[PDB]
Amino acid sequence: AEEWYFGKITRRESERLLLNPENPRGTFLVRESETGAYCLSVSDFDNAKGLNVKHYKIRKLDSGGFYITSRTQFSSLQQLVAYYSKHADGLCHRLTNVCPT
Ligand SMILES: [Cl-]
Ligand SMILES: [Cl-]
């Protein structure tokens, strides 16, 4: 899908969008790594930080496969988004809602 792909948006810009108070815990967006890789940014919550954002670097295997953890890989970013919206499996929270605006 292209809806959760925000492209060349910076890390602080994605945080300002994800920190939106109407956003359900687990709101996300995929963007290009600021530092040719991609990044999954997810909104989270805890009492110390309150509303916050987690950033995961989406890496690629040399055999062609996207990954974030060590036991799961995908053929596309859409397959990765789909898997993580069903299971958190290592992520702070599972993907629940595509980031607004
Ligand atoms: Cl980055
Ligand atoms: Cl990073």
Side-chain angles (χ1 to χ4, degrees), residues 1-7 9-59 61 63-69 72-78 80-101:
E2 197 68 41
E3 198 133 297
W4 35 259
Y5 186 72
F6 283 39
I9 191 181
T10 72
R11 190 181 76 210
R12 181 51 186 172
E13 299 179 331
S14 67
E15 292 180 322
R16 188 163 53 236
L17 289 176
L18 291 172
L19 281 165
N20 191 316
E22 309 181 66
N23 284 354
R25 189 175 173 198
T27 298
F28 70 104
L29 55 76
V30 173
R31 58 186 180 76
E32 307 192 20
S33 181
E34 199 158 39
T35 63
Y38 297 89
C39 291
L40 172 51
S41 297
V42 202
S43 63
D44 211 329
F45 183 82
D46 71 67
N47 190 261
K49 298 169 190 181
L51 290 167
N52 63 287
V53 179
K54 295 295 195 287
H55 296 287
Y56 299 98
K57 192 178 181 174
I58 303 170
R59 306 166 189 283
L61 294 170
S63 65
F66 295 113
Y67 68 101
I68 301 179
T69 64
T72 313
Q73 57 159 291
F74 312 89
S75 63
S76 65
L77 300 167
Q78 178 177 55
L80 184 146
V81 174
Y83 172 78
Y84 285 121
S85 61
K86 294 169 186 167
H87 331 275
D89 183 38
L91 253 53
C92 66
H93 194 281
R94 70 165 182 111
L95 303 184
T96 63
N97 164 250
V98 179
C99 193
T101 304

XYZ file of all heavy atoms in Angstrom, unseen atoms left out:
797
model
N 0.882 -1.199 0.000
C 0.000 0.000 0.000
C 0.899 1.222 0.000
O 2.077 1.125 0.328
C -0.903 0.005 1.236
N 0.333 2.367 -0.363
C 1.082 3.608 -0.449
C 0.625 4.577 0.641
O 1.298 5.565 0.903
C 0.863 4.227 -1.844
C 1.855 5.309 -2.284
C 3.267 4.791 -2.538
O 3.407 3.695 -3.130
O 4.242 5.490 -2.162
N -0.504 4.287 1.290
C -1.046 5.168 2.332
C -0.152 5.353 3.580
O -0.011 6.462 4.089
C -2.443 4.677 2.750
C -3.282 5.718 3.483
C -4.714 5.829 2.949
O -4.903 6.196 1.763
O -5.658 5.555 3.719
N 0.472 4.279 4.053
C 1.331 4.376 5.229
C 2.781 4.715 4.885
O 3.653 4.733 5.758
C 1.273 3.073 6.030
C 1.131 1.871 5.173
C -0.011 1.163 4.931
C 2.166 1.229 4.427
N 0.248 0.119 4.075
C 1.577 0.140 3.743
C 3.535 1.479 4.253
C 2.311 -0.708 2.920
C 4.265 0.638 3.432
C 3.651 -0.440 2.768
N 3.040 4.963 3.604
C 4.385 5.321 3.163
C 4.475 6.837 3.019
O 3.923 7.411 2.071
C 4.710 4.682 1.819
C 6.142 4.915 1.420
C 7.176 4.255 2.075
C 6.469 5.840 0.433
C 8.506 4.504 1.758
C 7.801 6.100 0.108
C 8.811 5.428 0.777
O 10.128 5.686 0.475
N 5.179 7.476 3.950
C 5.318 8.925 3.944
C 6.562 9.462 3.229
O 6.805 10.668 3.207
C 5.250 9.447 5.384
C 3.845 9.484 5.954
C 2.933 8.465 5.678
C 3.446 10.521 6.788
C 1.649 8.483 6.216
C 2.166 10.545 7.332
C 1.267 9.520 7.045
N 7.352 8.559 2.651
C 8.540 8.953 1.908
C 9.663 9.696 2.614
O 10.112 9.292 3.688
N 10.090 10.801 2.004
C 11.192 11.630 2.499
C 10.877 12.583 3.647
O 11.342 13.730 3.660
C 11.780 12.413 1.345
N 10.102 12.106 4.612
C 9.731 12.899 5.775
C 10.830 12.679 6.841
O 11.290 11.550 7.049
C 8.322 12.450 6.293
C 7.800 13.427 7.338
C 8.389 11.048 6.916
C 6.441 13.028 7.904
N 11.257 13.747 7.505
C 12.308 13.646 8.518
C 11.805 12.987 9.800
O 10.595 12.830 9.990
C 12.887 15.038 8.878
O 11.932 15.782 9.650
C 13.230 15.816 7.612
N 12.727 12.632 10.692
C 12.361 11.977 11.948
C 11.534 12.837 12.900
O 10.627 12.330 13.560
C 13.603 11.494 12.693
C 13.271 10.603 13.890
C 14.524 10.152 14.613
N 15.067 11.244 15.411
C 16.359 11.402 15.688
N 17.250 10.532 15.225
N 16.758 12.439 16.427
N 11.841 14.129 12.973
C 11.098 15.024 13.854
C 9.706 15.311 13.297
O 8.754 15.495 14.054
C 11.860 16.334 14.058
C 11.154 17.313 14.991
C 10.750 16.643 16.295
N 9.943 17.531 17.129
C 9.330 17.159 18.248
N 9.429 15.906 18.680
N 8.599 18.034 18.924
N 9.587 15.326 11.970
C 8.301 15.567 11.322
C 7.353 14.399 11.583
O 6.177 14.613 11.885
C 8.484 15.770 9.813
C 9.369 16.974 9.468
C 9.581 17.160 7.978
O 9.556 16.160 7.237
O 9.791 18.312 7.549
N 7.884 13.174 11.509
C 7.090 11.967 11.739
C 6.660 11.879 13.205
O 5.571 11.395 13.514
C 7.874 10.709 11.317
O 9.006 10.455 12.137
N 7.505 12.391 14.098
C 7.188 12.394 15.524
C 6.061 13.382 15.832
O 5.164 13.082 16.617
C 8.421 12.749 16.356
C 9.495 11.684 16.316
C 10.711 12.042 17.148
O 11.097 13.239 17.169
O 11.290 11.125 17.768
N 6.098 14.548 15.192
C 5.068 15.558 15.400
C 3.698 15.034 14.944
O 2.677 15.308 15.579
C 5.434 16.838 14.646
C 4.543 18.029 14.933
C 5.207 19.330 14.479
N 5.633 19.277 13.080
C 6.879 19.506 12.675
N 7.820 19.809 13.567
N 7.192 19.416 11.386
N 3.689 14.247 13.867
C 2.451 13.675 13.344
C 1.957 12.527 14.212
O 0.770 12.424 14.506
C 2.656 13.153 11.920
C 2.852 14.176 10.800
C 3.132 13.428 9.498
C 1.617 15.073 10.658
N 2.890 11.681 14.634
C 2.563 10.524 15.444
C 2.195 10.875 16.873
O 1.466 10.127 17.513
C 3.723 9.530 15.419
C 3.921 8.854 14.058
C 5.198 8.036 14.064
C 2.719 7.968 13.750
N 2.673 12.023 17.357
C 2.378 12.474 18.717
C 0.979 13.078 18.848
O 0.592 13.541 19.924
C 3.434 13.480 19.199
C 4.761 12.881 19.687
C 5.819 13.962 19.784
C 4.569 12.204 21.049
N 0.225 13.057 17.745
C -1.161 13.549 17.683
C -1.965 12.788 18.751
O -2.068 11.563 18.696
C -1.740 13.246 16.295
C -3.066 13.936 16.036
O -3.950 13.963 16.892
N -3.215 14.486 14.836
N -2.551 13.512 19.718
C -3.343 12.933 20.815
C -4.582 12.110 20.467
O -5.073 11.345 21.295
C -3.661 14.145 21.692
C -3.698 15.268 20.719
C -2.527 14.983 19.805
N -5.077 12.239 19.243
C -6.247 11.467 18.836
C -5.791 10.124 18.267
O -6.605 9.245 17.991
C -7.053 12.216 17.769
C -7.401 13.652 18.118
C -8.222 14.316 17.029
O -9.374 13.882 16.810
O -7.720 15.260 16.383
N -4.479 9.975 18.094
C -3.896 8.749 17.557
C -3.944 7.581 18.534
O -3.502 7.708 19.677
C -2.423 8.956 17.180
C -2.238 9.730 15.891
O -3.191 10.030 15.194
N -0.994 10.046 15.571
N -4.468 6.425 18.094
C -4.545 5.237 18.954
C -3.120 4.705 19.141
O -2.273 4.899 18.266
C -5.385 4.258 18.130
C -6.146 5.137 17.183
C -5.139 6.179 16.807
N -2.851 4.057 20.273
C -1.530 3.488 20.536
C -1.204 2.479 19.434
O -1.987 1.574 19.164
C -1.516 2.790 21.896
C -0.134 2.355 22.362
C -0.182 1.785 23.776
N 1.109 1.229 24.165
C 1.297 0.378 25.174
N 0.275 -0.026 25.920
N 2.511 -0.087 25.426
N -0.074 2.675 18.766
C 0.297 1.776 17.691
C 0.120 2.398 16.315
O 0.219 1.701 15.299
N -0.147 3.708 16.276
C -0.307 4.429 15.007
C 1.076 4.419 14.364
O 2.086 4.512 15.065
C -0.776 5.886 15.222
O -2.054 5.887 15.861
C -0.904 6.617 13.893
N 1.124 4.293 13.043
C 2.411 4.202 12.379
C 2.517 4.823 10.987
O 1.533 5.264 10.382
C 2.802 2.726 12.264
C 1.957 1.962 11.274
C 2.462 1.636 10.015
C 0.646 1.623 11.575
C 1.676 0.999 9.067
C -0.158 0.979 10.624
C 0.364 0.664 9.370
N 3.749 4.803 10.487
C 4.076 5.288 9.165
C 5.443 4.715 8.806
O 6.255 4.414 9.683
C 4.091 6.830 9.121
C 4.931 7.719 10.051
C 6.404 7.731 9.640
C 4.370 9.137 9.992
N 5.677 4.531 7.518
C 6.960 4.040 7.045
C 7.549 5.234 6.318
O 6.829 5.974 5.661
C 6.803 2.862 6.064
C 8.152 2.501 5.457
C 6.217 1.662 6.787
N 8.851 5.426 6.444
C 9.507 6.550 5.801
C 10.916 6.122 5.431
O 11.369 5.054 5.836
C 9.564 7.736 6.775
C 10.290 7.410 8.084
C 10.214 8.539 9.099
N 10.910 8.202 10.338
C 12.233 8.208 10.484
N 13.019 8.539 9.468
N 12.770 7.877 11.648
N 11.616 6.964 4.677
C 12.985 6.659 4.288
C 13.890 6.969 5.479
O 13.624 7.903 6.231
C 13.415 7.521 3.105
C 12.497 7.478 1.901
C 13.129 8.120 0.685
O 14.372 8.242 0.667
O 12.390 8.497 -0.251
N 14.947 6.183 5.668
C 15.878 6.427 6.761
C 16.639 7.709 6.406
O 17.135 7.908 5.315
C 16.879 5.294 6.933
O 17.764 5.534 8.026
N 16.670 8.567 7.411
C 17.305 9.878 7.398
C 18.830 9.714 7.414
O 19.566 10.576 6.870
C 16.806 10.591 8.661
C 16.922 12.074 8.706
C 15.936 12.626 9.710
O 15.747 12.003 10.774
O 15.332 13.671 9.444
N 19.298 8.607 8.000
C 20.710 8.293 8.156
C 21.110 7.021 7.401
O 21.936 7.120 6.470
C 21.071 8.092 9.656
O 20.345 6.978 10.179
C 20.714 9.333 10.468
N 20.109 4.218 2.169
C 18.934 3.821 1.322
C 17.934 2.892 1.998
O 17.203 2.166 1.317
N 17.873 2.923 3.329
C 16.960 2.052 4.082
C 15.641 2.733 4.447
O 15.427 3.903 4.133
C 17.648 1.552 5.348
N 14.755 1.989 5.106
C 13.465 2.527 5.526
C 13.297 2.537 7.045
O 14.121 1.981 7.779
C 12.329 1.724 4.904
C 12.297 1.805 3.404
C 13.004 0.894 2.620
C 11.581 2.805 2.766
C 12.997 0.982 1.231
C 11.566 2.907 1.391
C 12.275 1.994 0.626
O 12.260 2.106 -0.746
N 12.231 3.174 7.519
C 11.977 3.223 8.949
C 10.501 3.143 9.285
O 9.656 3.772 8.642
C 12.538 4.511 9.570
S 14.342 4.646 9.617
N 10.206 2.364 10.311
C 8.847 2.218 10.802
C 8.784 3.033 12.091
O 9.529 2.757 13.037
C 8.540 0.746 11.100
C 7.211 0.413 11.795
C 6.025 1.069 11.078
C 7.052 -1.089 11.833
N 7.923 4.042 12.126
C 7.772 4.870 13.317
C 6.383 4.608 13.893
O 5.367 4.768 13.202
C 7.962 6.346 12.963
O 9.278 6.589 12.486
N 6.356 4.191 15.159
C 5.125 3.835 15.855
C 4.880 4.667 17.120
O 5.801 4.935 17.892
C 5.162 2.327 16.267
C 3.751 1.783 16.491
C 5.888 1.516 15.203
N 3.628 5.058 17.344
C 3.293 5.824 18.538
C 3.109 4.847 19.695
O 2.626 3.733 19.504
C 2.013 6.652 18.323
O 0.877 5.836 18.097
N 3.500 5.269 20.891
C 3.391 4.421 22.069
C 2.979 5.255 23.278
O 2.735 6.452 23.154
C 4.734 3.748 22.347
C 4.578 2.386 22.989
O 3.601 2.178 23.731
O 5.438 1.522 22.763
N 2.909 4.615 24.442
C 2.527 5.288 25.671
C 3.095 4.600 26.905
O 3.219 3.377 26.956
C 0.999 5.320 25.812
C 0.513 6.079 27.029
C 0.411 7.462 27.004
C 0.189 5.408 28.207
C 0.002 8.175 28.128
C -0.223 6.114 29.350
C -0.317 7.500 29.306
N 3.437 5.416 27.894
C 3.904 4.959 29.200
C 3.764 6.198 30.081
O 3.685 7.305 29.563
C 5.341 4.383 29.160
C 6.422 5.425 28.941
O 6.639 6.272 29.839
O 7.068 5.379 27.874
N 3.721 6.019 31.395
C 3.548 7.138 32.318
C 4.687 8.163 32.378
O 4.433 9.351 32.596
C 3.261 6.583 33.721
C 2.833 7.651 34.706
O 3.637 8.129 35.499
N 1.574 8.040 34.645
N 5.929 7.719 32.176
C 7.083 8.617 32.242
C 7.190 9.560 31.055
O 7.358 10.763 31.222
C 8.360 7.814 32.362
N 7.079 9.013 29.853
C 7.169 9.820 28.647
C 5.807 10.341 28.201
O 5.710 11.382 27.553
C 7.759 8.990 27.505
C 9.162 8.483 27.753
C 9.576 7.451 26.692
C 10.878 6.772 27.072
N 11.298 5.783 26.040
N 4.753 9.612 28.552
C 3.424 9.974 28.103
C 3.358 9.465 26.672
O 3.849 8.373 26.398
N 2.806 10.247 25.749
C 2.735 9.828 24.353
C 4.130 9.932 23.749
O 4.795 10.951 23.902
C 1.759 10.712 23.572
C 0.276 10.533 23.928
C -0.534 11.661 23.331
C -0.241 9.188 23.422
N 4.590 8.867 23.097
C 5.917 8.899 22.496
C 6.016 8.097 21.203
O 5.093 7.374 20.824
C 6.984 8.422 23.495
C 6.791 6.983 23.918
O 5.883 6.661 24.690
N 7.638 6.101 23.395
N 7.157 8.223 20.534
C 7.357 7.540 19.266
C 8.569 6.617 19.265
O 9.661 6.982 19.715
C 7.478 8.577 18.108
C 7.703 7.884 16.767
C 6.208 9.420 18.045
N 8.349 5.415 18.749
C 9.394 4.409 18.629
C 9.777 4.357 17.146
O 8.909 4.398 16.274
C 8.880 3.039 19.095
C 8.515 2.936 20.589
C 9.736 3.124 21.477
C 9.484 2.663 22.918
N 8.609 3.542 23.766
N 11.078 4.298 16.879
C 11.609 4.235 15.517
C 12.364 2.927 15.330
O 13.283 2.621 16.095
C 12.581 5.390 15.260
C 11.947 6.743 15.326
N 11.114 7.222 14.340
C 12.015 7.713 16.268
C 10.696 8.429 14.671
N 11.226 8.752 15.836
N 11.977 2.165 14.312
C 12.622 0.896 14.004
C 13.254 0.980 12.614
O 12.605 1.381 11.649
C 11.604 -0.238 14.028
C 10.924 -0.433 15.366
C 9.656 0.107 15.605
C 11.539 -1.151 16.394
C 9.019 -0.062 16.833
C 10.908 -1.325 17.623
C 9.648 -0.776 17.832
O 9.007 -0.922 19.035
N 14.523 0.607 12.515
C 15.218 0.649 11.237
C 14.884 -0.597 10.436
O 15.116 -1.711 10.893
C 16.731 0.726 11.457
C 17.552 1.054 10.199
C 19.032 1.165 10.528
C 19.852 1.520 9.295
N 21.301 1.771 9.613
N 14.322 -0.414 9.247
C 13.989 -1.549 8.404
C 15.204 -1.870 7.532
O 15.556 -1.104 6.634
C 12.761 -1.249 7.529
C 11.589 -0.871 8.436
C 12.382 -2.488 6.698
C 10.402 -0.329 7.707
N 15.833 -3.003 7.819
C 17.020 -3.443 7.105
C 16.683 -4.439 6.008
O 15.590 -4.999 5.978
C 17.992 -4.099 8.086
C 18.345 -3.240 9.277
C 19.013 -4.065 10.363
N 19.161 -3.294 11.598
C 20.093 -2.367 11.787
N 20.965 -2.103 10.823
N 20.140 -1.686 12.924
N 17.633 -4.665 5.111
C 17.422 -5.615 4.031
C 18.500 -6.686 4.046
O 19.667 -6.414 4.315
C 17.410 -4.891 2.684
N 18.103 -7.921 3.775
C 19.055 -9.015 3.725
C 19.718 -8.912 2.365
O 19.184 -8.261 1.470
C 18.331 -10.351 3.832
C 17.643 -10.643 5.159
C 16.790 -11.879 4.993
C 18.689 -10.837 6.265
N 20.873 -9.553 2.206
C 21.588 -9.522 0.933
C 20.889 -10.413 -0.093
O 21.064 -10.241 -1.291
C 23.021 -9.966 1.137
N 20.074 -11.347 0.396
C 19.312 -12.255 -0.459
C 17.982 -11.634 -0.880
O 17.194 -12.255 -1.594
C 19.021 -13.564 0.272
O 18.166 -13.353 1.385
N 17.721 -10.418 -0.412
C 16.474 -9.761 -0.766
C 15.330 -10.092 0.178
O 14.551 -11.018 -0.064
N 15.239 -9.324 1.259
C 14.194 -9.518 2.251
C 14.299 -8.438 3.317
O 15.388 -8.184 3.849
N 13.178 -7.792 3.632
C 13.159 -6.738 4.646
C 13.002 -7.311 6.056
O 12.278 -8.285 6.259
C 11.999 -5.770 4.393
C 12.116 -4.987 3.114
C 11.220 -5.207 2.068
C 13.093 -4.003 2.969
C 11.288 -4.452 0.888
C 13.175 -3.239 1.791
C 12.270 -3.465 0.749
N 13.677 -6.712 7.031
C 13.541 -7.187 8.400
C 13.829 -6.113 9.440
O 14.417 -5.074 9.136
C 14.441 -8.405 8.639
C 15.918 -8.107 8.612
C 16.641 -7.983 9.798
C 16.596 -7.953 7.404
C 18.011 -7.714 9.788
C 17.967 -7.685 7.380
C 18.669 -7.568 8.579
O 20.025 -7.316 8.578
N 13.391 -6.382 10.664
C 13.586 -5.485 11.796
C 14.177 -6.311 12.940
O 15.031 -5.833 13.688
C 12.238 -4.862 12.255
C 11.597 -4.094 11.091
C 12.459 -3.937 13.458
C 10.254 -3.465 11.430
N 13.718 -7.556 13.068
C 14.202 -8.445 14.122
C 15.044 -9.585 13.571
O 15.364 -9.618 12.387
C 13.031 -9.049 14.955
O 12.206 -9.874 14.121
C 12.183 -7.944 15.557
N 15.367 -10.540 14.434
C 16.203 -11.660 14.049
C 15.515 -13.020 14.041
O 15.823 -13.869 14.881
C 17.426 -11.712 14.965
N 14.593 -13.231 13.100
C 13.867 -14.508 12.952
C 12.649 -14.294 12.059
O 11.833 -15.207 11.862
C 13.419 -15.064 14.320
N 12.520 -13.075 11.538
C 11.414 -12.720 10.657
C 11.901 -11.796 9.539
O 12.572 -10.796 9.793
C 10.287 -11.998 11.434
O 9.997 -12.716 12.640
C 9.017 -11.951 10.607
N 11.558 -12.141 8.301
C 11.928 -11.344 7.134
C 10.724 -11.297 6.198
O 9.813 -12.120 6.322
C 13.120 -11.969 6.419
C 12.899 -13.404 5.992
C 13.840 -13.808 4.888
O 13.728 -13.321 3.758
N 14.785 -14.685 5.204
N 10.704 -10.334 5.275
C 9.574 -10.187 4.356
C 10.060 -9.845 2.954
O 11.165 -9.342 2.789
C 8.642 -9.076 4.855
C 8.298 -9.186 6.311
C 9.109 -8.587 7.273
C 7.210 -9.943 6.728
C 8.846 -8.746 8.634
C 6.938 -10.106 8.089
C 7.759 -9.506 9.040
N 9.224 -10.096 1.948
C 9.590 -9.817 0.554
C 9.305 -8.371 0.154
O 9.864 -7.860 -0.819
C 8.837 -10.768 -0.395
O 7.417 -10.589 -0.337
N 8.426 -7.720 0.905
C 8.063 -6.338 0.641
C 7.718 -5.640 1.947
O 7.459 -6.294 2.966
C 6.860 -6.266 -0.320
O 5.669 -6.804 0.251
N 7.714 -4.309 1.917
C 7.373 -3.516 3.100
C 5.884 -3.685 3.432
O 5.487 -3.593 4.594
C 7.687 -2.040 2.863
C 9.138 -1.685 2.547
C 9.214 -0.244 2.031
C 9.993 -1.869 3.783
N 5.067 -3.962 2.413
C 3.637 -4.172 2.637
C 3.368 -5.483 3.381
O 2.392 -5.592 4.127
C 2.854 -4.186 1.317
C 1.350 -4.450 1.515
C 0.541 -4.399 0.221
O 0.850 -5.104 -0.747
N -0.505 -3.570 0.203
N 4.238 -6.475 3.181
C 4.087 -7.768 3.847
C 4.528 -7.607 5.300
O 3.993 -8.256 6.202
C 4.932 -8.825 3.139
N 5.491 -6.709 5.504
C 6.036 -6.392 6.825
C 4.992 -5.645 7.664
O 4.794 -5.952 8.837
C 7.300 -5.531 6.675
C 8.109 -5.145 7.923
C 9.578 -5.093 7.558
C 7.633 -3.821 8.490
N 4.326 -4.674 7.036
C 3.290 -3.865 7.681
C 2.109 -4.751 8.071
O 1.588 -4.653 9.183
C 2.790 -2.730 6.733
C 1.614 -1.984 7.366
C 3.934 -1.769 6.424
N 1.730 -5.635 7.151
C 0.633 -6.575 7.341
C 0.874 -7.549 8.503
O -0.032 -7.817 9.293
C 0.393 -7.350 6.056
N 2.101 -8.056 8.608
C 2.488 -8.993 9.673
C 2.450 -8.305 11.034
O 1.877 -8.834 11.986
C 3.907 -9.534 9.421
C 4.492 -10.376 10.550
C 4.109 -11.707 10.726
C 5.407 -9.828 11.457
C 4.624 -12.477 11.776
C 5.923 -10.582 12.514
C 5.528 -11.910 12.666
O 6.037 -12.682 13.695
N 3.055 -7.120 11.108
C 3.110 -6.376 12.356
C 1.821 -5.709 12.805
O 1.738 -5.223 13.930
C 4.256 -5.362 12.312
C 5.610 -6.019 12.466
C 6.588 -5.904 11.478
C 5.907 -6.770 13.599
C 7.833 -6.522 11.620
C 7.136 -7.395 13.750
C 8.100 -7.268 12.759
O 9.321 -7.895 12.911
N 0.806 -5.694 11.944
C -0.479 -5.117 12.333
C -1.338 -6.227 12.967
O -2.422 -5.969 13.498
C -1.196 -4.492 11.125
O -1.464 -5.448 10.118
N -0.821 -7.454 12.913
C -1.476 -8.632 13.491
C -0.743 -9.084 14.754
O -1.363 -9.506 15.729
C -1.472 -9.801 12.494
C -2.318 -9.583 11.249
C -2.059 -10.662 10.196
C -2.814 -10.342 8.900
N -2.374 -11.159 7.727
N 0.582 -9.011 14.719
C 1.409 -9.437 15.843
C 2.464 -8.378 16.145
O 3.131 -7.886 15.235
C 2.156 -10.744 15.512
C 1.451 -11.629 14.529
N 0.482 -12.538 14.900
C 1.562 -11.729 13.182
C 0.027 -13.159 13.826
N 0.666 -12.687 12.770
N 2.636 -8.036 17.420
C 3.661 -7.066 17.793
C 5.009 -7.772 17.615
O 5.923 -7.229 17.000
C 3.472 -6.615 19.235
N 5.101 -8.995 18.141
C 6.288 -9.860 18.050
C 7.632 -9.116 18.109
O 8.408 -9.107 17.146
C 6.159 -10.713 16.772
C 7.290 -11.723 16.590
O 7.755 -12.311 17.587
O 7.699 -11.925 15.425
N 7.897 -8.477 19.241
C 9.143 -7.743 19.363
C 8.968 -6.240 19.280
O 9.772 -5.496 19.832
N 7.933 -5.778 18.587
C 7.686 -4.337 18.487
C 7.064 -3.840 19.797
O 6.491 -4.625 20.548
C 6.738 -4.034 17.328
C 7.342 -3.396 16.072
C 8.525 -4.209 15.575
C 6.259 -3.281 15.011
N 7.173 -2.539 20.067
C 6.612 -1.954 21.285
C 5.105 -2.205 21.366
O 4.563 -2.512 22.428
C 6.899 -0.441 21.329
S 6.072 0.622 20.046
N 4.449 -2.107 20.215
C 3.007 -2.308 20.106
C 2.748 -2.749 18.662
O 3.537 -2.436 17.773
C 2.301 -0.978 20.404
C 0.829 -1.099 20.662
N -0.099 -1.245 19.653
C 0.124 -1.057 21.818
C -1.313 -1.281 20.176
N -1.205 -1.168 21.487
N 1.662 -3.477 18.412
C 1.368 -3.898 17.036
C 0.822 -2.687 16.269
O 0.317 -1.742 16.879
C 0.328 -5.025 17.002
C -1.075 -4.594 17.400
C -2.141 -5.615 17.025
N -3.455 -5.098 17.389
C -4.388 -4.727 16.520
N -4.174 -4.831 15.213
N -5.520 -4.186 16.960
N 0.919 -2.721 14.943
C 0.441 -1.626 14.109
C -1.079 -1.624 14.073
O -1.707 -2.567 13.592
C 1.031 -1.758 12.703
C 2.568 -1.793 12.746
C 3.150 -1.816 11.341
C 3.069 -0.570 13.508
N -1.662 -0.555 14.601
C -3.110 -0.439 14.694
C -3.799 0.563 13.787
O -4.970 0.382 13.440
C -3.549 -0.056 16.131
O -3.018 1.236 16.467
C -3.055 -1.081 17.139
N -3.097 1.623 13.419
C -3.732 2.675 12.638
C -2.693 3.460 11.844
O -1.638 3.791 12.375
C -4.513 3.552 13.651
C -4.924 4.917 13.114
O -4.385 5.945 13.543
N -5.879 4.937 12.192
N -2.997 3.748 10.576
C -2.096 4.520 9.707
C -2.149 5.993 10.153
O -3.237 6.549 10.338
C -2.522 4.402 8.211
C -1.603 5.225 7.317
C -2.472 2.954 7.778
N -0.978 6.610 10.327
C -0.872 8.002 10.790
C -1.610 9.049 9.956
O -1.397 9.166 8.748
C 0.594 8.412 10.915
S 0.843 9.957 11.807
N -2.508 9.810 10.606
C -3.334 10.874 10.027
C -2.534 12.084 9.544
O -1.460 12.382 10.072
C -4.277 11.246 11.177
C -4.396 9.985 11.947
C -2.973 9.481 11.968
N -3.080 12.750 8.527
C -2.528 13.957 7.891
C -1.092 13.853 7.382
O -0.389 12.867 7.702
C -2.666 15.191 8.843
O -4.042 15.357 9.202
C -2.200 16.488 8.168
Cl 16.859 7.343 10.826
Cl 18.023 4.582 12.997
